[PDB]
C-alpha cells in the first residue's frame, strides 16, 4: 500500500518496501502520482518504469500500490471518444484543464461520470435467475446506431438478487447485485479488463465471409474476409469506415506525426454515412486512439493493446469490428526503446528478440468467434495493420515478421505511384491466403468468379515476362498471341485496377458490378485467343492490328464500364448494360469472320 | 524411481522478465521442470535454467505477468522434461507441450522417454536404400527421396509450401510393387493454417497414419523449441522400437530458429552471427540427425524440413546451416506460383543427393534414372529457347526450337501441375514422363541409353 522511492535513474524508478508487489501491476509514483509499471522485483525492492516524465521525483516519495495491471475501462461512453494509448480521454482533459497541454499525472476518468444513460434490462432475468460470465443483462441506447449491450465480466457467476429498474443511470451506481455461494458482490455499468489478457470466447469459427472493401482491386484479386488480418505497406482505411460491412471502427495511430494526427481529428466529425436514407456522422460508430511521437514511449507501445481490447469488447456484443492499427512500425520503435532501457540483448538490428512474439500476440486476437454468453451471438474483429518500412523492403525485422503472421498482404510500392494510378497496387508481391476459405462463398453466391480470377491474375503475369523484352527489343518480331496479352492486359490496367477516390463513380465499387466488369474482359480475351489460333493456318490469317481498327467502338464500351456510376444508376441497371454489351461482343467478332 | 515427495518453495528472490529466481533450494537439478502456482490460482509451468548452490533460476513458459515474491508457490518435480509415448497416439492432435486438443483423452504411456534424445551410433547406421513415395510428381519423378534422407523444402512467405506439406502427408507411403506413419510437427503456425492442418488430415481419411503436433504462433516461444523434440522422440519410438517407416515433416524450421533466438536472448546470452545463437549449428543438428536407418531393426526415419527464406536469401544462416547438414533441397519457386501452377516446384535448382540410390530396378523401376535426367536436360534447353524466342521471334525459330517450346508447355501443365488431391503414384509419374518424351524422336534423346529406349519409347 505504501512504498518509497529509493532512487530514480532516468525513466526507471527503484522503489523499496514493496514486498508483495506483482509484476506488471500499476503504481502511482511520486507526489504528482505518475503512473508506473513494475517490471523487475529483487527481493523486496521493485524496479518501476514510469509512464510519464520523471523530472522532479525525489527519493522518499510515496508509491501507491494498486492491485491491478494496465487495464482499460469498458462500458457505455466509448463510441466517439478520443482516447490515448493508456486511455486518457483527450476531449475532456482539454475541458477540465482548459489548456493545450497534457499535464503530468492527470487522473481523469476514461468514461464520463456525469452522463445519464438509459438502462434497459434484458427482460429475461429476474430476482433469482442464473447468470454466468458473458450473459447480457442490459441494453444502453448509446446513440442511434449502437445498441450498447451491457455484459457480465468473465469469471463471474451466480444468482441475481437485485436488478436495476429501467430508467436513466450514471456509470457509477450499482446496477447488478448477484450472489455467488455465500458472498454478495456489486456490479457497476462499466467493467475493467487488462489489455494484455485475451478476452475469452467459446470457440473460434472460421473466417468465411468476405470483408467487402469498397474497391475493385483488393476485393477481386486479393480478397480479405471478416476475421482476417491484412497489411498495408488513408484511402484504403477511410473507404472501410463509410461503406464496409463493419459496425464498429477502431482507429489506432501508435506514433504518428502531430500534424497528420491533427488531420484525422479534423476530418472524421465531418464524415457522413448512409444507413436508411438518413445521413449520420460516422463518429457514432468509431472510437479513436490518439497518440503522437511527443507522447510517452510507454503509452505508445500500450496503444496497440488498448486498441485491440477495445476492439474485442464490441465483438462480444455481436458486432463485426474492424480495427485499423496505423503505423505498426512506429509501435515497434516503441519496443526498441523499452528494451534498451531494460538492458535487454537485441537480436536483429536493435529490435528485441521477441518482436514476432508480441506481434503474433496482437494479430492473433482477430477472427470470427462464437461469443461468450447466452443468446448465441456471433461477432468478429478484423485487424488492418500498416507497416512503414525504411524505404520499401522486407529486410527490416518489422515488415518481415509481419508477413510471417498475417494472411493478406496488400503490397504497395513507391515506384508504382507516379503513374497517377492511385492506389499504388503492385500485384506481384501482394497476396491473399483467403482464397481457399472463400471457395464456398464464390461457388455458391457467385458460381463463376474463381476461373475468371484465375485467368485475370495470369494475364497480368504474362505481361510482366514480356515487358522486359518489349522494352529492349520493342514489338518488332513478336507472336500475335502475345499482342493480345499486352492490349487486353493493358485494358485491365487502366479500366479494372485503376481508381480515383474522390470521384462520383469510384468511391464505392459493388461486387456484382465488380464481377460484371470482369465477365466481359475475360470473354474478350478468350475470344481474341480462339480467333487467332483457329485462323493461324487456314486462309486469311489475321493479326491484332486488323481487329482494333475494325472494333474501335467495341473497345469504347469495354473502356466505359468504370465510368458508369454505381450510385445514381439502378441495381439492375448495370448488369443488363453488361449483358447487352456481351451480345455486342459475341456478334462483333462474327462481323470479322 | 522418484518416490520421494516434492518440495514446494515460496522463497522467490526476484522476477526479471521471464525469469523467476528462487533461493534456499535443496539440491536443484539442471533443466528440471517446476510447476508455479500464482496468487489467484493460475498454474504455470517452467524449466530450471541455472543452479548455483542454493539458488535456481526458473524460466516460466507462460510469462511472469502476475508473480509476486511473497505469495507464489513453486513446486519442483525432481525429474526432467519427458514425453509419454504410445503407439495409439497415431491419430491424435497434440499441441506444443504435448496436450491433446482434439477433445481426446490423455495418452496412456507405453514409455517415458527423455525428449532430448541420445545420438545414434555412427557405426550402427545403414545407407538409405528404398523409396518414400510422396505423390507429388515434381519430387518423386525427378527429386526422389530415399528412406532416411533429410531433404528440406525451400520456400518463402506467401508461397504455398504449407499446402505442399499437407499434400505430402495425405499421400505419403511406400513404393508398392502396415509399417508407415507420419509425424507432422507444425511450429509457429497461425490459427487459420492450424485449422487447415487439423481439418484436412482428419476428413481426408488418413488421420490414422499421422500424429499431429500443432504449435501455434501465439503460444509461448519456449514451447516451439520442445515441439520438434516431442515429434522426433515419438518418431524414434514408432520407428526404432515398433519397426515402422516414419516420415517426419517439420513445418517452418525458420520459425523454430526465431523462437530459439528469442529463448536464447531471454536466457541472458550474447548473440552470435546475424543475431542467432553461436550454437545454432549444433542445435539444428540435434534435430536433423535424428534420422536414417539403423542396423538390426526394420524401421527408418526420413525427415522433410521446410524453410522460409527471408527476402529469398540463401546466405541467411537458417538456409545456410540447413543446406550444410541436410542432403539437397526442393526449391518451391515464386515465378511458378504467379503463373498459377500447383505445386510450384522448381526443377532446375532442386536436387536430391541420395536420389541415385532410391531409384532403379527392384526399388522403383528400371528407367527411373534415365527418364529423370532426360526430362532435366529438355527442361533446361527449353527454358533457354523460352527466353530466346522473345529475342528473335517465332518466325526465326526452326523445327528444333519448336519441339522444345511445345514440350515446355506440356511439362509444366502435366508433369509439374498436379492439383491438390491427385495422388500420382510413381508408376504413373513415369508414364506421364514418357508421353512428354515422345514429342521428340529417338534421334534426339541423348541422355537415355539405347537399351531402354527400345523397351519404353514405342507405346
Amino acid at each position: 500500500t505504501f512504498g518509497y522511492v529509493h532512487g530514480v535513474s532516468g525513466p526507471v524508478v527503484t522503489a523499496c518496501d514493496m514486498a508483495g508487489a506483482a509484476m506488471y501491476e500499476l503504481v502511482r509514483v511520486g507526489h504528482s502520482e505518475l503512473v508506473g509499471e513494475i517490471i523487475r522485483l529483487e527481493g523486496d525492492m521493485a524496479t518501476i518504469q514510469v509512464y510519464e516524465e520523471t523530472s522532479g521525483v525525489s527519493v522518499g516519495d510515496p508509491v501507491l500500490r494498486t492491485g491491478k495491471p494496465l487495464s482499460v475501462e469498458l462500458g457505455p461512453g466509448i463510441m466517439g471518444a478520443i482516447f490515448d494509448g493508456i486511455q486518457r480521454p483527450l476531449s475532456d482533459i482539454s475541458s477540465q484543464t482548459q489548456s493545450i497541454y497534457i499535464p503530468r499525472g492527470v487522473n481523469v476518468s476514461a468514461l464520463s461520470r456525469d452522463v445519464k444513460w438509459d438502462f434497459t434490462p434484458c427482460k429475461n432475468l429476474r430476482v433469482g435467475s442464473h447468470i454466468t460470465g458473458g450473459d447480457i443483462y442490459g441494453i444502453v441506447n448509446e446513440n442511434s446506431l449502437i445498441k450498447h449491450k451491457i455484459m457480465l465480466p468473465p469469471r463471474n457467476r451466480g444468482t441475481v438478487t437485485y436488478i436495476a429498474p429501467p430508467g436513466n443511470y450514471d456509470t457509477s451506481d450499482v446496477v447488478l447485485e448477484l450472489e455467488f455461494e455465500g458472498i454478495k458482490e456489486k456490479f457497476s455499468m462499466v467493467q475493467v479488463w487488462p489489455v494484455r489478457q485475451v478476452r475469452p470466447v467459446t470457440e473460434k469459427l472460421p473466417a468465411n465471409h468476405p470483408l467487402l472493401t469498397g474497391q475493385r482491386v483488393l476485393d477481386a484479386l486479393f480478397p480479405c474476409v471478416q476475421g482476417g488480418t491484412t497489411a498495408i505497406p488513408t484511402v484504403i482505411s477511410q473507404s472501410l469506415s463509410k461503406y464496409s460491412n463493419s459496425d464498429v471502427i477502431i482507429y489506432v495511430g501508435c506514433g504518428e506525426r502531430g500534424n497528420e494526427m491533427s488531420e484525422v481529428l479534423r476530418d472524421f466529425p465531418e464524415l457522413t454515412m448512409e444507413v436508411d436514407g438518413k445521413v449520420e456522422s460516422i463518429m457514432k460508430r468509431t472510437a479513436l486512439v490518439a497518440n503522437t511521437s511527443n507522447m510517452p514511449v510507454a503509452a505508445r507501445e500500450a496503444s496497440i493493446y488498448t486498441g485491440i481490447t477495445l476492439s474485442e469488447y464490441f465483438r462480444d456484443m455481436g458486432y463485426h469490428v474492424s480495427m485499423m492499427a496505423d503505423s505498426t512500425s512506429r509501435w515497434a520503435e516503441a519496443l526498441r526503446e523499452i528494451s534498451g532501457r531494460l538492458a535487454e540483448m537485441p537480436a536483429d538490428s536493435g529490435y528485441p528478440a521477441y518482436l514476432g512474439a508480441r506481434l503474433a500476440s496482437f494479430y492473433e486476437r482477430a477472427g470470427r468467434v462464437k461469443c461468450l454468453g447466452n443468446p448465441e451471438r456471433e461477432g468478429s474483429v478484423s485487424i488492418v495493420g500498416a507497416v512503414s518500412p525504411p524505404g520499401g523492403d522486407f529486410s527490416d525485422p518489422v515488415t518481415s515478421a509481419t508477413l510471417g503472421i498475417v494472411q493478406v498482404f496488400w503490397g504497395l510500392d513507391k515506384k508504382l505511384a507516379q503513374r497517377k494510378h492511385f492506389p499504388s497496387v503492385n500485384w506481384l508481391i501482394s497476396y491473399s491466403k483467403y482464397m481457399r476459405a472463400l471457395d464456398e462463398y464464390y461457388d455458391k453466391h457467385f458460381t463463376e468468379f474463381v476461373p475468371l480470377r484465375t485467368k485475370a491474375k495470369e494475364i497480368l503475369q504474362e505481361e510482366e515476362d514480356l515487358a522486359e523484352i518489349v522494352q529492349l527489343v520493342g514489338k518488332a518480331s513478336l507472336a500475335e498471341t502475345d499482342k493480345i496479352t499486352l492490349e487486353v492486359a493493358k485494358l485491365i490496367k487502366d479500366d479494372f485496377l485503376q481508381q480515383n477516390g474522390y470521384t462520383p463513380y469510384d468511391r464505392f465499387c459493388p461486387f456484382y458490378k465488380t464481377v460484371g466488369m470482369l465477365s466481359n474482359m475475360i470473354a474478350f480475351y478468350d475470344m481474341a485467343r480462339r480467333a487467332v489460333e483457329t485462323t493461324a493456318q487456314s486462309d486469311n490469317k489475321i493479326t491484332w492490328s486488323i481487329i482494333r481498327e475494325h472494333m474501335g467502338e467495341i473497345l469504347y464500351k469495354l473502356s466505359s464500364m468504370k465510368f458508369k456510376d454505381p450510385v445514381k444508376d439502378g441495381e439492375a441497371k448495370i448488369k443488363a448494360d453488361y449483358a447487352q454489351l456481351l451480345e455486342d461482343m459475341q456478334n462483333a467478332f462474327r462481323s470479322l469472320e | 524411481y522418484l518416490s520421494q515427495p516434492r518440495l514446494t518453495y515460496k522463497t522467490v528472490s526476484g522476477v526479471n522478465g521471464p525469469l523467476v529466481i528462487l533461493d534456499h533450494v535443496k539440491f536443484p537439478r539442471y533443466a528440471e521442470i517446476v510447476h508455479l502456482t500464482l496468487p489467484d490460482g493460475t498454474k504455470r509451468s517452467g524449466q530450471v535454467l541455472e543452479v548455483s548452490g542454493s539458488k535456481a533460476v526458473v524460466q516460466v513458459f507462460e510469462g511472469t505477468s502476475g508473480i509476486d515474491a511473497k505469495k507464489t508457490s513453486c513446486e519442483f518435480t525432481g525429474d526432467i522434461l519427458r514425453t509419454p509415448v504410445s503407439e495409439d497416439m497415431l491419430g491424435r492432435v497434440f499441441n506444443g507441450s504435448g496436450k491433446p486438443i482434439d477433445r481426446g483423452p490423455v495418452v496412456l504411456a507405453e514409455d517415458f522417454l527423455d525428449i532430448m534424445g541420445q545420438p545414434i551410433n555412427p557405426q550402427c547406421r545403414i545407407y538409405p536404400e528404398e523409396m518414400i513415395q510422396t505423390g507429388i510428381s515434381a519430387i518423386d519423378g525427378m527429386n526422389s527421396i530415399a528412406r532416411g534422407q533429410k531433404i528440406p523444402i525451400f520456400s518463402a512467405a506467401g508461397l504455398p509450401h504449407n499446402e505442399i506439406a499437407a499434400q505430402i502427408c495425405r499421400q505419403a507411403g511406400l513404393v508398392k510393387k502396415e509399417n508407415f506413419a507420419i509425424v507432422f510437427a507444425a511450429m509457429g503456425v497461425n490459427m487459420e493454417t492450424a485449422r487447415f492442418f487439423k481439418s484436412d488430415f482428419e476428413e481426408n481419411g488418413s488421420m490414422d497414419n499421422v500424429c499431429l503436433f500443432l504449435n501455434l504462433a501465439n503460444d509461448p516461444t519456449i514451447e516451439r523449441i520442445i515441439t520438434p523434440r516431442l515429434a522426433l522422440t515419438t518418431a524414434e519410438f514408432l520407428a526404432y522400437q515398433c519397426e515402422k517407416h516414419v516420415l517426419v515433416i517439420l513445418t517452418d524450421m525458420s520459425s523454430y530458429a526465431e523462437a530459439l533466438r528469442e529463448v536464447s536472448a531471454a536466457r541472458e546470452e550474447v548473440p552470435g552471427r546475424r543475431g542467432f545463437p553461436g550454437y545454432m549449428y549444433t542445435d539444428l543438428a540435434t534435430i536433423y540427425e535424428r534420422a536414417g536407418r539403423v542396423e538390426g531393426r526394420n524401421g527408418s526415419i526420413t525427415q522433410i524440413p521446410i524453410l522460409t527464406m527471408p527476402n529469398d536469401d540463401i546466405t541467411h544462416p537458417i538456409p545456410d546451416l540447413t543446406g550444410y547438414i541436410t542432403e539437397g533441397q526442393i526449391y518451391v519457386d515464386r515465378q511458378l506460383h504467379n503463373r498459377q501452377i500447383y505445386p510450384p516446384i522448381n526443377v532446375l535448382p532442386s536436387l536430391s543427393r541420395l536420389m541415385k540410390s532410391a531409384i532403379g530396378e527392384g526399388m522403383t523401376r528400371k528407367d527411373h534414372a534415365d527418364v529423370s535426367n532426360q526430362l532435366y536436360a529438355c527442361y533446361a534447353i527449353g527454358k533457354d529457347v523460352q527466353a530466346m524466342k522473345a529475342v528473335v521471334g517465332e518466325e526465326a525459330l526452326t523445327s528444333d526450337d519448336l519441339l522444345y517450346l511445345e514440350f515446355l508447355q506440356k511439362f509444366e501443365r502435366n508433369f509439374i501441375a498436379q492439383g491438390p488431391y491427385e495422388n500420382r503414384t510413381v508408376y504413373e509419374t513415369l508414364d506421364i514422363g514418357w508421353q512428354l518424351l515422345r514429342i521428340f524422336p529417338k534421334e534426339m534423346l541423348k541422355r537415355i541409353p539405347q537399351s531402354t529406349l527400345s523397351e519404353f519409347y514405342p507405346r
Binding site: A343, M345, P346 | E268, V270, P271
Partner: peptide
C-alpha cells in the same frame, strides 16, 4: 558484442555487492 558483454559484468558487480 563487447558492449552487450560489458554491461553484463557490471550487473554482476552490482549483485556481488548484495
Amino acid at each position: 558484442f563487447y558492449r552487450l558483454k560489458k554491461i553484463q559484468e557490471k550487473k554482476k558487480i552490482l549483485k556481488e555487492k548484495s
